[PDB]
Amino acid sequence: EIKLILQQYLEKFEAHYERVLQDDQALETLMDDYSEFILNPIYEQQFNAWRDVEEKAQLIKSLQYITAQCVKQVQVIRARRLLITSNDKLLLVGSGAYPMTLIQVAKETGASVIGIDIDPQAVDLGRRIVNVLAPNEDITITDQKVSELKDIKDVTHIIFSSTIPLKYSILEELYDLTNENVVVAMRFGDGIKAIFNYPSQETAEDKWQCVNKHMRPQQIFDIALYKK
């Protein structure tokens, strides 16, 4: 029964994705409904109760991919359609093409801000969005990896986009690169929330310690803070 609904969503997301690329003018309504489904206790129970390892795992992986691209493409359109304290320095891994949140933090806090994104399109647009929304804020947007960033030791706060598949592989890499007092915020979704997020992982106990795990029954992602 739960299998069916997920198959319907997977088909719809691919259709809405295939479709929105052809014409920017639906998908955003589907995602809102998708959340209501993920956050439903009824379907949280059925999701856990269903233990067909093979067909379940495959369905999560597929929805994880298409929803990640859908969200990624929403920000691309929104961009072209439009077009922590002061001494701290925030690093948002997965800044996106429409970095509105990144802007919000820059204004309220006044901190330095580095955004990285592997998509050259997201970086290219993001920069343009920042130059209109906050040109007089210390906001650097680049396609550099964490290892490439020169002033990586100055970074105090790190946030990860939930929809980054190998976010924990990056977190692993950051230990040696970053200073001793750095704090990391890892967005994730476990259980039924893993169909619109990538899940948490166990960290090397000698490296990263999880000092907080903020679960929210009414929100689409949960948060896990990490220290050294």
Ligand SMILES: C[S@@+](CC[C@H](N)C(=O)[O-])C[C@H]1O[C@@H](n2cnc3c(N)ncnc32)[C@H](O)[C@@H]1O
């Ligand atoms: C949907 S967007 C913006 C963040 C979104 N508001 C969220 O909270 O998930 C996520 C971005 O992460 C980027 N991304 C994916 N894998 C990445 C990686 N390994 N390093 C950096 N950015 C990555 C994608 O290009 C995508 O534009």
Ligand SMILES: [Ca+2]
């Ligand atoms: Ca400070």
